PDB file of C-alpha atoms in Angstrom:
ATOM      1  CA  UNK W   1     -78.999  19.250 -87.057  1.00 44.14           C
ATOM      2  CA  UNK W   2     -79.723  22.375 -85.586  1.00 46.87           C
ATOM      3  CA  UNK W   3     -80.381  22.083 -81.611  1.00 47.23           C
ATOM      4  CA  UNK W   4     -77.867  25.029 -79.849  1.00 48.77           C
ATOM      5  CA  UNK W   5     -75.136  23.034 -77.996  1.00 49.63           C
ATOM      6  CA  UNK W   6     -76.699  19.428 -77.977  1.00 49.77           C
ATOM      7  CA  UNK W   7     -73.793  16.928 -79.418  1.00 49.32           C
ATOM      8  CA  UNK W   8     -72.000  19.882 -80.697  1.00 48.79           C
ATOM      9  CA  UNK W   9     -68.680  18.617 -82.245  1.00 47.64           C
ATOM     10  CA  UNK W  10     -70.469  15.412 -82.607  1.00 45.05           C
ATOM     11  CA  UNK W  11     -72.352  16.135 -85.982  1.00 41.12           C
ATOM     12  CA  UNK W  12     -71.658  16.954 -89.831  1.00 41.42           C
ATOM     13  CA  UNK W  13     -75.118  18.224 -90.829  1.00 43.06           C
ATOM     14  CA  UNK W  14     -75.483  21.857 -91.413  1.00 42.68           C
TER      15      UNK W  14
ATOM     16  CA  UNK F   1     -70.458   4.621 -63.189  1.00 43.49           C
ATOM     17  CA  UNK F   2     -70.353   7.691 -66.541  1.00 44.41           C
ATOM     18  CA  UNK F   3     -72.944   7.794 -68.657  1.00 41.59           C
ATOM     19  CA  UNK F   4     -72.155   5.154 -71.563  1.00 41.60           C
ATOM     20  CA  UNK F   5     -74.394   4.320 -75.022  1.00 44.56           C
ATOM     21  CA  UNK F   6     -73.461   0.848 -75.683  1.00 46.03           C
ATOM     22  CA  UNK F   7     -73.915  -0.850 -79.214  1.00 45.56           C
ATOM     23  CA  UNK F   8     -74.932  -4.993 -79.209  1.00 45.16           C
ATOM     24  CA  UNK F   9     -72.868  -4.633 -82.654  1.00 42.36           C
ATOM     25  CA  UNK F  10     -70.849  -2.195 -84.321  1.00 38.60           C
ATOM     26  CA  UNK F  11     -70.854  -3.666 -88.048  1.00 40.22           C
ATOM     27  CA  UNK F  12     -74.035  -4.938 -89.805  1.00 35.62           C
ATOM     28  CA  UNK F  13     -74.146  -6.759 -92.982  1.00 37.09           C
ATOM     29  CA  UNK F  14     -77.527  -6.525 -94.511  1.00 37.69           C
ATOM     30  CA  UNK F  15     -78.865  -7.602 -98.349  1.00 37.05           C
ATOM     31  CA  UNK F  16     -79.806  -4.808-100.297  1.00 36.58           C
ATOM     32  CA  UNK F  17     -83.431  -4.147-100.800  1.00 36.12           C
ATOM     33  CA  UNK F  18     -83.963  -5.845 -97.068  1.00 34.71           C
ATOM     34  CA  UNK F  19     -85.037  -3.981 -93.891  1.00 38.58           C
ATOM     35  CA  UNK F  20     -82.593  -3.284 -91.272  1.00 38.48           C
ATOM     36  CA  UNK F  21     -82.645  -2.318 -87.543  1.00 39.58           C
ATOM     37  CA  UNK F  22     -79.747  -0.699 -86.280  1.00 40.86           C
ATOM     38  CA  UNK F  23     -79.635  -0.213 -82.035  1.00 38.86           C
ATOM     39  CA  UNK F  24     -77.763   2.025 -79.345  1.00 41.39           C
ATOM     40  CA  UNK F  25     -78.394   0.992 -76.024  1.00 39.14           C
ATOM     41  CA  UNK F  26     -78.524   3.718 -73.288  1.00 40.39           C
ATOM     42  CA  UNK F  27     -78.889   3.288 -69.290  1.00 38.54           C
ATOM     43  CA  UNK F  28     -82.491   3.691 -68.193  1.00 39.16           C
ATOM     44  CA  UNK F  29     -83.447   2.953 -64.470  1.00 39.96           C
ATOM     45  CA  UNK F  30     -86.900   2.739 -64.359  1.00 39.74           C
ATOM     46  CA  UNK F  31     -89.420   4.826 -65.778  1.00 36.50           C
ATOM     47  CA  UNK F  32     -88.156   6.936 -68.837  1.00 34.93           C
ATOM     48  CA  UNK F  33     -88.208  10.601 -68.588  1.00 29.81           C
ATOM     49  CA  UNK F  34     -89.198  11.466 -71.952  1.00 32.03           C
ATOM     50  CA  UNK F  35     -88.726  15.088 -70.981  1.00 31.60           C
ATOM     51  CA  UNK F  36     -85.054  14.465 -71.070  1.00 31.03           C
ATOM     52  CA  UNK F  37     -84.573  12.037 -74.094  1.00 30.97           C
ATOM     53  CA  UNK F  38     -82.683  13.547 -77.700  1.00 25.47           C
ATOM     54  CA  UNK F  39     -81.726  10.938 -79.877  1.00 26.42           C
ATOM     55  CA  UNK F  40     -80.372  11.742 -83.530  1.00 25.45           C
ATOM     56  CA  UNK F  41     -78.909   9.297 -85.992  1.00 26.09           C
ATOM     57  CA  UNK F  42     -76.760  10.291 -88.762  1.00 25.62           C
ATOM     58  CA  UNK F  43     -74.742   9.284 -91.198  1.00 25.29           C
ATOM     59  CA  UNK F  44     -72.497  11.165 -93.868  1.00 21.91           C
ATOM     60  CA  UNK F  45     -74.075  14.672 -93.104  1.00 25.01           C
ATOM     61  CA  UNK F  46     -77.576  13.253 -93.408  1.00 22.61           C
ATOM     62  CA  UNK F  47     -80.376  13.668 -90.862  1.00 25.91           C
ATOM     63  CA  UNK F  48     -82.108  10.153 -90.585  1.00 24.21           C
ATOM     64  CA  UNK F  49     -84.018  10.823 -87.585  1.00 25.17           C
ATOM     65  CA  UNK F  50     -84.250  13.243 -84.383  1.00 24.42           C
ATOM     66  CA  UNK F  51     -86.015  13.358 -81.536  1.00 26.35           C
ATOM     67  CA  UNK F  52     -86.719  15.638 -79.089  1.00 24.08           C
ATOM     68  CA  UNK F  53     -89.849  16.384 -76.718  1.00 27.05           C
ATOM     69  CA  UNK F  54     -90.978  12.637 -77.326  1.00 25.42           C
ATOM     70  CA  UNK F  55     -91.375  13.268 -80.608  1.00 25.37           C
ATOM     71  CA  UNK F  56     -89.677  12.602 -84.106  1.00 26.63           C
ATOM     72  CA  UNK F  57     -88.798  16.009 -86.027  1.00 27.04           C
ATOM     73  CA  UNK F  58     -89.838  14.514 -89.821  1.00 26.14           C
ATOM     74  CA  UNK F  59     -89.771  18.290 -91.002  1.00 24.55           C
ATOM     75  CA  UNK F  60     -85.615  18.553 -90.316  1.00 24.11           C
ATOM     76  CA  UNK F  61     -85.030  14.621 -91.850  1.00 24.72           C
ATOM     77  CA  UNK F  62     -83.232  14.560 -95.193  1.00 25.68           C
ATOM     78  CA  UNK F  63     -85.473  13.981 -97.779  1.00 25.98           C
ATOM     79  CA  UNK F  64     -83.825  10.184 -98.877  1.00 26.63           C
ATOM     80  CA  UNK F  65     -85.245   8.964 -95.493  1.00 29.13           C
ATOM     81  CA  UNK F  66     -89.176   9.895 -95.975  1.00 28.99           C
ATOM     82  CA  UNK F  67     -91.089   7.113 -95.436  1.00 28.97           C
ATOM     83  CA  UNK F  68     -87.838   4.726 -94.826  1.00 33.17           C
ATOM     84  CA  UNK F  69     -86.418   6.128 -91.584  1.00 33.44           C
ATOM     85  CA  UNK F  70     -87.966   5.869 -88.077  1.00 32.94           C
ATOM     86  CA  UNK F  71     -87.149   4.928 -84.388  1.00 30.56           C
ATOM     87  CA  UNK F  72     -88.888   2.088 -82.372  1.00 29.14           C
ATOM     88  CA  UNK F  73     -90.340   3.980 -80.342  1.00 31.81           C
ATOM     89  CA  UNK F  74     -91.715   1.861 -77.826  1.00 32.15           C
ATOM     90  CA  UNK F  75     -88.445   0.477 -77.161  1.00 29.56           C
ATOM     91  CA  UNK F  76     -86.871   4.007 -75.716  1.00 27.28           C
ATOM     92  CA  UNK F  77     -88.964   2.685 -72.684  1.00 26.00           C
ATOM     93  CA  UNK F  78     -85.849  -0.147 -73.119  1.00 25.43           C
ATOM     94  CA  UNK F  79     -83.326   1.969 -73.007  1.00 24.57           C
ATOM     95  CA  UNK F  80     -82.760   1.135 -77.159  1.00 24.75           C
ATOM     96  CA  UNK F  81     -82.609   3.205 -80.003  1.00 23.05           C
ATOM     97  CA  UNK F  82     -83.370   1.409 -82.725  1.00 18.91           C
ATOM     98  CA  UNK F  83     -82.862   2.970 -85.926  1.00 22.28           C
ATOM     99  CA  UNK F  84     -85.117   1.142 -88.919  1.00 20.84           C
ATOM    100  CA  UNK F  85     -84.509   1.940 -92.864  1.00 24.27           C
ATOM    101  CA  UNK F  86     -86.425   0.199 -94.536  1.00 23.46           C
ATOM    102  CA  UNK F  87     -85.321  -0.793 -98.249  1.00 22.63           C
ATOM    103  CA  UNK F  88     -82.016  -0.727 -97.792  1.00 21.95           C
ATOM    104  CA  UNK F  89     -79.871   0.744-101.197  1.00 17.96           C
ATOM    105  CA  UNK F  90     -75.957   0.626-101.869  1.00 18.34           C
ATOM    106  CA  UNK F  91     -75.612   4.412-100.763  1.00 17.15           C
ATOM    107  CA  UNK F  92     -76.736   3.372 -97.136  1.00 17.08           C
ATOM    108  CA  UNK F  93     -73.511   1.575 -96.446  1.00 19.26           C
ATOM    109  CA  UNK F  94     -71.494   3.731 -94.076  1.00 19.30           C
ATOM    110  CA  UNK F  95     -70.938   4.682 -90.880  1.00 17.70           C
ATOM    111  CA  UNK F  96     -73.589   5.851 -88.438  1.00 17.13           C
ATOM    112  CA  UNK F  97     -73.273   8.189 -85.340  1.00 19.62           C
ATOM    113  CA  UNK F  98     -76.293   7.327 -82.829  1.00 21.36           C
ATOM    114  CA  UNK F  99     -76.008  10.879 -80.171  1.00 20.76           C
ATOM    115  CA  UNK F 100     -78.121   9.967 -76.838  1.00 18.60           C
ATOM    116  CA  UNK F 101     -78.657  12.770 -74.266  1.00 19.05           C
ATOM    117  CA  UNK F 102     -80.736  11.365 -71.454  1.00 18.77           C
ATOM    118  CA  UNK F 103     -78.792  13.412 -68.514  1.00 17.76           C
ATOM    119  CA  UNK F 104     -75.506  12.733 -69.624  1.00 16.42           C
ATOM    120  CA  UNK F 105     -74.633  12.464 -73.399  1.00 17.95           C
ATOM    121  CA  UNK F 106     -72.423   9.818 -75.597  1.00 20.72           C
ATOM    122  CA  UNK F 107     -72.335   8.644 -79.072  1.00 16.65           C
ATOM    123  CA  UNK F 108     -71.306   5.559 -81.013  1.00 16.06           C
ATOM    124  CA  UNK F 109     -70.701   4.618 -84.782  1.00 16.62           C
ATOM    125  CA  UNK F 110     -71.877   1.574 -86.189  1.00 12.77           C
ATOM    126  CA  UNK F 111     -70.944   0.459 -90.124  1.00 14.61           C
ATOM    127  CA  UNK F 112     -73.086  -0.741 -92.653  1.00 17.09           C
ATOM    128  CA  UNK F 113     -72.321  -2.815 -95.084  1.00 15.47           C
ATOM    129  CA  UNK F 114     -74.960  -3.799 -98.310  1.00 15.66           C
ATOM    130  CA  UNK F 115     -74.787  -7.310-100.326  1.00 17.90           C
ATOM    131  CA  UNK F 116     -75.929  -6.811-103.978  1.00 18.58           C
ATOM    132  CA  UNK F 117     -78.224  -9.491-104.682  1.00 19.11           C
ATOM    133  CA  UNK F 118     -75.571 -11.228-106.619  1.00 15.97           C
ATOM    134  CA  UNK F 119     -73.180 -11.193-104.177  1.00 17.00           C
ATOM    135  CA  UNK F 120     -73.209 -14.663-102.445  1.00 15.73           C
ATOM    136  CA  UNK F 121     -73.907 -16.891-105.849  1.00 10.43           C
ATOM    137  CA  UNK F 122     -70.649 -14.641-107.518  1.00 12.05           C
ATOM    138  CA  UNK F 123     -68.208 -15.147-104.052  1.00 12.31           C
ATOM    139  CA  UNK F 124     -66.073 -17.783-105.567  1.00 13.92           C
ATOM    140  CA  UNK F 125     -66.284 -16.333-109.189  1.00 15.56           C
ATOM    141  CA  UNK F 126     -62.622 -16.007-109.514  1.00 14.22           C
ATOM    142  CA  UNK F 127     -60.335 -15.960-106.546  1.00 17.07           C
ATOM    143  CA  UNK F 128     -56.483 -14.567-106.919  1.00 16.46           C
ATOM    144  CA  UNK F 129     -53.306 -14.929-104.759  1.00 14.73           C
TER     145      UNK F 129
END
């Protein structure tokens, strides 16, 4: 998921 | 009151080779503002489906999804993301992050369990204490 700082901390992917 | 993505359900139990719809509710007050919308679903560290710009992002999706994965679209306008896969295999079982910004930003996780078709005829096969 590559989108700056949206839902960072949220994700796994990448 | 804070900005809150609800689920209806946080464990589905769906037959293997069925559809299934999974849904994160998010507060909408009127009109959406589609400017404002991201949605992305994933599960493991798979991407089943983004969107951004009103618009899904098919070229970032893992490849498992193609043709299986999608939102409702028309019911964003709801305030739901719904999440269909269609033919639904043992390696979907899991647990699923739904990530809404719309303004303010939350996430939930829902699990998935799959029945193999066998399943419900085998149940009482051999039971042990």
């Amino acid at each position: 998921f590559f989108x700056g700082d949206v839902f960072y901390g949220w994700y796994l992917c990448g | 009151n804070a900005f809150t993505v609800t689920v209806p359900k946080d464990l589905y139990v769906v037959e293997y080779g069925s559809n299934m719809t999974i849904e994160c509710k998010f507060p909408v007050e009127k009109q959406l503002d589609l400017a404002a919308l991201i949605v992305y679903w994933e599960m493991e560290d798979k991407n089943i489906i983004q969107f951004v710009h009103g618009e899904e992002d098919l070229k970032v999706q893992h490849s498992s999804y193609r043709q299986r994965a999608r939102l409702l679209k028309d019911q964003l306008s709801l305030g739901n993301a719904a999440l269909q896969i269609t033919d639904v295999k043992l390696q979907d079982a899991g647990v699923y992050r739904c990530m809404i910004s719309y303004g303010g930003a939350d996430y939930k996780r829902i699990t998935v369990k799959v029945n193999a078709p066998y399943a419900a005829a085998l149940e009482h096969h051999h039971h042990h204490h």
